[PDB]
From TrEMBL:
This is Metallo-beta-lactamase AIM-1. The keyword Metal-binding applies. It comes from the Bacteria. Residues 31-224 form the Metallo-beta-lactamase domain. InterPro entries: Metallo-B-lactamas, NDM-1-like, RibonucZ/Hydroxyglut_hydro. One of its GO terms (molecular function) is metal ion binding. Keywords: Metal-binding, Signal, Zinc. Zn(2+) 2 binds at D82, H83, H224. It comes from Pseudomonas aeruginosa. Zn(2+) 1 binds at H78, H80, H156. SMART domains: Lactamase_B.
Length: 269
């Protein structure tokens, strides 16, 4: 029997790929999510894990019997190296454009963020993404019968996006949400409370939390699997129901508490 993935797994610890629900598959690592949303017209790849995870993601797509070349669109959560890291390499392998909201694009072209990113000073470089299609903040990415809807999720980064779509197992369809990271973390310099340094940034973060909280939400997945207890819901260690219509509300509500705790820590400094 397989031991599965721990909640404290290394970001590059390999995971056996598995179904999440219907035509949504998990192809990431034990520590970092990536998803493949499939059809007989081609596929949408969601996220890219670290700069080291390219071959793992490609091997996992193939392990499930899908061809990387049948991927017709790549989307991602946010422009940190641990989720955007292999985007260039995956774009080479698949031939697919990468869709990005405007505030993430400069990071993807430079290979590093600027000071708009809370983690600017700790960012690790990523291969620049050659072919980017600009995504409207509520845009839809369509491949054949597939339709992924962008929910702009600035806060953790300026360019972050959550994704939502429907996956079906027969006549039974579920609203999938791949909710972006909502953690109020930063380098040692950035202050979420210094509005003059970035006007409206924290208000947009709060608005993001409210919007995620309100999403129709049958099955939640997050870029760090443990942030949503993913490995208690799929895989060998699962002992909670996969479907939970409260999950996005609990996730966003938790992130709000932690954001407020971050503001308290800044006030004390
Ligand atoms: Ca996360
Ligand atoms: Mg468990
Ligand atoms: Zn991040
Ligand atoms: Zn991350």
């Amino acid at each position: 029997a397989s031991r599965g993935c721990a909640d404290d797994a290394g970001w590059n610890d390999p995971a056996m790929p598995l179904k999440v629900y219907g035509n949504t598959w998990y192809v990431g690592t034990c520590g970092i999510s990536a998803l493949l949303v499939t059809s007989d017209a081609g596929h949408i790849l969601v996220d890219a894990a670290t700069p080291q995870a390219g071959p793992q993601i490609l091997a996992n797509i193939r392990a499930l019997g899908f061809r990387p070349e049948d991927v017709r669109a790549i989307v991602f959560s946010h422009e940190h190296f641990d989720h955007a890291g292999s985007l260039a390499e995956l774009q080479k392998a698949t031939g697919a454009p990468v869709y990005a909201r405007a505030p993430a694009i400069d990071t993807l072209k430079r290979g590093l963020p600027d000071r708009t990113d809370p983690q600017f000073e700790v960012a690790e470089p990523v291969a620049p993404v050659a072919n980017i299609v600009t995504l409207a903040d509520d845009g839809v990415v369509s491949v054949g019968p597939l339709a992924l809807t962008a929910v702009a999720s600035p806060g953790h980064t300026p360019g972050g996006t959550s994704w939502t779509w429907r996956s079906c197992e027969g006549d039974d369809c579920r609203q999938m949400v791949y909710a972006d990271s909502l953690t109020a973390i930063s380098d040692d310099v950035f202050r979420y409370s210094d509005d003059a340094a970035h006007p409206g940034y924290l208000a947009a973060f709060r608005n993001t939390l409210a919007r995620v909280a309100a999403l129709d939400c049958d099955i939640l997945v997050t870029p760090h699997p443990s942030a949503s207890g993913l490995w208690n819901r799929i895989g060998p260690r699962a002992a909670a129901p996969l479907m939970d219509t409260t999950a996005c509300r609990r996730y966003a509500q938790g992130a709000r508490q932690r954001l407020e705790k971050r503001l308290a820590e800044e006030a004390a400094t």
